[PDB]
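Raw record, unedited: eosinophil granule major basic protein 1
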Amino acid sequence: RYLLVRSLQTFSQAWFTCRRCYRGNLVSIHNFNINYRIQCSVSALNQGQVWIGGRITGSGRCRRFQWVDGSRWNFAYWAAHQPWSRGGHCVALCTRGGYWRRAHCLRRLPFICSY
C-alpha cells in the first residue's frame, strides 16, 4: 500500500515521517505498473515532483543506488534529460510523466510512503 503526504519536507524529514506517522518507509518502485499507479495518484498536485525512497550513497568513484526500505534496486524510470552529475543524491518522481530525477536532498517536496 502507499499514500501521499502533501506536506513539504526534506528527504530526511520525509524518511522520518513515513516511518513514524505511518509505520512504513518512503516508497520503493520495482516495476512500471506501480510507477504508473503512483504517477496517477500525484497527477493533480501543483508541485512538480515528490520524494520516493531512493538515494545515491558512498564517496569517491564507486557508489550505489539504494532504497531506504532495503529492497533491491531493480527498476528505474529516469527522465532522459535532466541535470545528472551533481544533480543531488536523493530521488524524486515527477508529477508529470512519472519520470524520476535526481534532486538535492535538502529541497522540500510532498512525498509517497508505503506501508
